Amino acid sequence: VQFKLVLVGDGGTGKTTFVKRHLTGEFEKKYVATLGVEVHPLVFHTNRGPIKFNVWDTAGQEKFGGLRDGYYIQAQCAIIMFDVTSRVTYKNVPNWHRDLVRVCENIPIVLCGNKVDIKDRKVKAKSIVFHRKKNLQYYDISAKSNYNFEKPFLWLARKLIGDPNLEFVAMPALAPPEVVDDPALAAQYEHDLEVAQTTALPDEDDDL
């Protein structure tokens, strides 16, 4: 049970960060521009079984755009991303939407305003109305604070499966191995752990 999802939007808006948060849990602080597209499988467990999104994380910079709308072929859903701290990224949302729906005429689409954790917000809530006439779902999100970070996939899953009562459920948790190697017998243990201890954890001012 798998669905192709294309993710589009201006460069630097947070598309790859958002995907990596969902894939691995990490928060990537650096901006490494995507070159063309990167495809990542992404599985969610629901009360209706597992759902798999094949996430086509496309490039937002024009000089890295690769195949451009060629990536959209046979997409079954999409996320359009912009950055609420950068008004030009919202002004370009109609352009990304135009290219997308010319290729995918009848798919569910989420519009996402990212970086709502930043205090100096430039694209205010009341400005954001593009989704109304285009029948897109909209969410304020933050890949950094994870505010609403699950909502785009939960909404898409409800639309693709055709069940508005679909929910994410706790994945099964098998009993883990009981016989394990002593790591302290592994020789490189002393060097490997010292490096870990003397590399500071990031964001020590955060609440967790």
Partner: peptide, 11 residues
């Protein structure tokens, strides 16, 4: 949180 996905499972 939210996804309920397992990030640690070990003895």
């Amino acid at each position: 949180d939210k996804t309920l996905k397992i990030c640690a499972n070990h003895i």
